[PDB]
Write a protein that binds this DNA or RNA. Structure first.
Ligand SMILES: CN(C)S(=O)(=O)c1cc(O)c(O)c2c1CN(Cc1ccc(F)c(Cl)c1)C2=O
Ligand SMILES: CN(C)S(=O)(=O)c1cc(O)c(O)c2c1CN(Cc1ccc(F)c(Cl)c1)C2=O
Ligand SMILES: [Mg+2]
Ligand SMILES: [Mg+2]
Ligand SMILES: [Mg+2]
Ligand SMILES: [Mg+2]
Ligand SMILES: [Mg+2]
Ligand SMILES: [Mg+2]
Ligand SMILES: [Zn+2]
Ligand SMILES: [Zn+2]
Lengths: 368, 184, 368, 184
DNA sequence: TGCGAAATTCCATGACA
DNA sequence: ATTGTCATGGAATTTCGCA
DNA sequence: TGCGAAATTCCATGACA
DNA sequence: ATTGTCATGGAATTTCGCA
């Protein structure tokens, strides 16, 4: 306040105020003749108020706030005071966008065996077809082999029915799904515990985590659309056709079809491969075990030049799931409890709960 | 001549009538010849229509080169023949009154009948719900002749449901009592 | 057909069939022993049917289709036949996605003067506030200066009313808008002709073309949201506040506020700049004319490694605007009549009309 | 002492009552002192409330350091004073019965009254719709004293509506006839 | 022992409510 | 307590056929 | 005639239904 | 008949204060 500015007027050096400038009094205010013009030096005790008034005009960031202040004032290290206020404006913290990208995606290992891990998801609502509106899609992680079930709703009950049919063939170690209501119910949890199946859930609002099945959903819809061109959208009867067609389609990068990865030999479908015609089944199965272990696996791509990776203790904010009109897109800051992997974290959330959350649904809180 | 393979030949047959269960009366039994893998489908009748409907589910997973069956009406109809022809499936019939398949298939069919009989006594009406567990049991049953289960031969891996207790399959004193009582 | 394959069996060389391989007959078919195994060489007259059957299993692209065929057949230049069929499959052409990015965006010149060009647009529907649901946003192109009007609907009639108020101040040479119903009506066309104002419309479904005003819409909503945190969304009374706040906010890259760019001097608002206090108005206006001509202008960024730029005569397909469930995302191919600029084209459309269309809403038809 | 600038001082006044037009009776007239730029606002009354409502529109575009007016009731109320105080606007009153502004402003106000009078005769009820064109006319009128229009001084550019026919502003024989008839 | 053409591999692009 | 994916078609690169 | 720190500029990121 | 934009806050770079 006055002490600092008093010593200044009588020409004694205060750290932060360059000595080469002439500090005077005028109209009751301490002033300074600076290259850009004459500015007022407010007392220290006034500065927070000033920064806040300037910031609050339009809730501006660092430079746009500074530029307002600099019109009338000069003092040492103004930006440090601006940033301090930026870091405390609740309204800015929860409304502004991030300008840091998430760190590069993980490419988790392909499950080692068929039936190690299923990925399941719903597609729909679709145009009504025989009273059906949805498809349960079940994709085996190792093979890509896919099962399709028409349903009337994306319910637990229709999931259970379909999976009772599917698991007639084999029981998977793990079923991975997103947090759809169908999959997160206690009825579905019981259904799986009864069978020794572990349920694994995606972080919330992050369909990339179910990417294996989401990507198959694309192929399913794309083929259905093609087969329905210029006809009414009677898709129900094409599910079996699409299922078989996709299960026998080559992945160009793998040089195998999902059917081949599951069975190691084509069934009686068109253009069946015949290379192992002279092998015994055991020789065939032995080649299959080899084929399975040496499939192409992609690697984590380069980070973008301005990504961030989460650190224990960091303040971060979770994206608001379905933000109302004219409401913030971000929750209040919360703390990273645990870094599960570089793309997944436990945070101590906006209430008081632990939440496991994708980094794609977080921003690091700005201004420390 | 080429070694036998999964999908070379499916053997199909009906079992039933059975006591009603969720409206169903029969089981269409499909056994892959090479692996011994079994699939089962509940039907309301041993008709061509129920067979086509059930095999449309199976043949949307894998298509056999040959279907073998007896001369049941469902299998010898011109419709069923048209269906097979459309899918490039050859149909194969045993001569009437002389049903023949293979040792493995015959043994597997015997197992199916016996396992079904055993599990229906006490709950003759609840079999619809049990069909999945039955198939897993059958398909994870060790083959004395081949050193492997159907699951292992079909997929080339161990299963997550080994069925360690290779079971009695025989009816206990109690079960014979209530099985002779249920047909009273 | 038979001629070619006959000469082959008796060991005479046909172009395309490598001489070093043994071509024989078996089971009534010409065959060849190739490194990967024995394959059937169908007669030329059979090949189109084969390619089509293989393709149609799942409407696969080049490699996945080839891989099916190669299971049973070999002939010369198979991919050329596959590609020929890919190029004729209507269903594939209109359903598949593009894998080529649009060429790099244009950065059109900043309008030279205030009132040269207005950009206008609607925001909403918003939560009802005094019976109002929308905001007309009018942004001066040169300055960024923005006018806000609450309306009950995004109608021509409310646009006309608001602009009658705005044009009390000055008449713009050009008003740029998207193709909203409000702006494309004959009533609005008359309203502008009556005043000597030229109407300029964005290509359809391409809000980037109205980017000047869209970008202001963001700031408007962002500030409204901040001011409404923890209060009910009574936005009507904040429009005037937001208008003034944004018109007096610095752009960090420009070092000026829109108000300054329009007037060359701050009005009585907080932190008013005072650098020209000792200039006459004429000196001030002269500095303003200089400031206006030397503003930062960004340049066209680098093309992505796999972009395409449109060429007169090219077959291209326009994106379907609001595609129904299970329907193609692309229209049938059409021809580029005229390249207006590298990002904008006239095409002879899916009916028989000329359409001026953004390249972002086009893909080049695949397989020539 | 510093050169005069736009926004230094706004001169405000009411004109009216006028014949009803879309329910409006008065015009609040605002003239910027330095540029001569005019803004006009239709009101239903010369009240503080109508003034605040109209100036809230203007002051959301630009805020004057000083508002000058006569001692009209609307302008001398404690409410209007509170309003100005909230916006850091100094209020300035001419002494009662001695209205004074500046030559430029007086001339501009004279022009406004005359232009209004001329355009209302024949259509005394249609002025609401004409207010935009009136302002453009006024604001693109060349200033003999300064070498520029208000538009040019306010924005530092030519306008897209030059008003080349610097007009009569005088009432024709016909217009005097029907203006003396309208007050009958 | 190198050439021109074909075949195969690479890989950015975009869509899975 | 978890984690993107992969068909697609031009372009880049490798291999093939022949000498 | 170079240093440490502050100030300014750069610029990827993301949102405008 | 047309065409992206620009606030944001860390990082990179330049300038400032002093010697
Ligand atoms: C739109 N929501 C309600 S959602 O919470 O985000 C949700 C919920 C689900 O259960 C889903 O199956 C899907 C979604 C969104 N989405 C499309 C999508 C978008 C981007 C991607 F990267 C991928 Cl992979 C997929 C889904 O498939
Ligand atoms: C959603 N549609 C109906 S629309 O046809 O596309 C449409 C119609 C309008 O009139 C609009 O004002 C806007 C939109 C879409 N959009 C948001 C948006 C999205 C991406 C961008 F790059 C930019 Cl700049 C803006 C608009 O603001
Ligand atoms: Mg889902
Ligand atoms: Mg999904
Ligand atoms: Mg029988
Ligand atoms: Mg719009
Ligand atoms: Mg818009
Ligand atoms: Mg008066
Ligand atoms: Zn703020
Ligand atoms: Zn196709």
């Amino acid at each position: 306040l006055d002490a600092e500015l008093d010593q200044l007027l009588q020409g004694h050096y205060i750290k932060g105020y360059p000595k080469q400038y002439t500090y005077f009094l005028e109209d009751g205010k301490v002033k300074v003749s600076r290259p850009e013009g004459v500015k007022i030096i407010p007392p220290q005790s006034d500065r927070q108020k000033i920064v806040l008034q300037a910031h609050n005009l339009a809730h501006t960031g660092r430079e746009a706030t500074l530029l307002k202040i600099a019109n009338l004032y000069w003092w040492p290290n103004m930006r440090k005071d601006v940033v301090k206020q930026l870091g405390r404006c609740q309204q800015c913290l929860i409304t502004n966008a991030s300008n840091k990208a998430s760190g590069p995606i993980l490419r988790p290992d392909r499950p080692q065996k068929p039936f190690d891990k299923f990925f399941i998801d719903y597609i729909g609502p679709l145009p009504p077809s025989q009273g059906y509106l949805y498809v349960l899609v079940v994709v085996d992680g190792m093979t890509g082999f896919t099962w399709l079930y028409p349903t009337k709703a994306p319910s637990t009950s229709a999931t259970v029915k379909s999976l009772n049919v599917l698991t007639s063939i084999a029981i998977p170690k793990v079923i991975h799904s997103d947090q759809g209501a169908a999959f997160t119910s206690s009825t579905f949890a019981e259904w799986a515990k009864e069978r020794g199946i572990h349920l694994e859930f995606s972080t919330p609002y992050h369909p990339q985590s179910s990417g294996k099945v989401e990507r198959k959903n694309s192929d399913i819809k794309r083929l259905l659309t093609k087969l329905l061109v210029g006809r009414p959208t009677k898709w129900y009867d094409l599910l079996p056709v699409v299922q078989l067609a996709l299960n026998n389609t080559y992945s160009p990068v793998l040089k195998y079809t999902p059917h081949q990865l599951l069975f190691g030999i084509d069934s009686n479908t068109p253009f069946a491969n015949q290379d192992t015609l002279d092998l015994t089944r055991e020789e065939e199965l032995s080649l299959l075990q080899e084929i399975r272990t040496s499939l192409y696996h992609p690697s984590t791509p380069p980070a973008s030049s301005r990504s961030w990776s989460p650190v224990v203790g960091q303040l971060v904010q979770e994206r608001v799931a379905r933000p109302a009109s004219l409401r913030p897109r971000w929750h209040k800051p919360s703390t990273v409890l645990k870094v599960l992997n570089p793309r997944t974290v436990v945070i101590l959330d906006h209430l008081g709960n632990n939440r496991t959350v994708s980094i794609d649904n977080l921003k690091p809180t700005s201004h420390q | 001549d080429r070694p036998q393979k999964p999908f070379d030949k499916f053997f199909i047959d009906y079992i039933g009538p059975l006591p009603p269960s969720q409206g169903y009366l029969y089981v269409l039994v499909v056994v892959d010849g090479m692996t011994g893998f079994t699939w089962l489908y509940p039907t309301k009748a041993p008709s061509t229509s129920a067979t086509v409907k059930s095999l449309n589910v199976l043949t949307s997973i894998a298509i056999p080169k040959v279907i073998h069956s007896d001369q049941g009406a469902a299998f010898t109809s011109s419709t069923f023949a048209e269906w097979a022809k459309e899918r490039g499936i050859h149909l194969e019939f045993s001569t009437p009154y002389h049903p023949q398949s293979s040792g493995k298939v015959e043994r597997k069919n015997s197992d199916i009948k016996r396992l079904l009989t055993k599990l229906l006594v006490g709950r003759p009406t609840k079999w619809y719900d049990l069909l999945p567990v039955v198939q897993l049991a059958l398909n994870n049953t060790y083959s004395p002749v081949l050193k492997y289960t159907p699951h292992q031969l079909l997929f080339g891996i161990d299963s997550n449901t080994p069925f360690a207790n290779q079971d009695t399959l025989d009816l206990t004193r109690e079960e014979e009592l209530s099985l002779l009582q249920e047909i009273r």
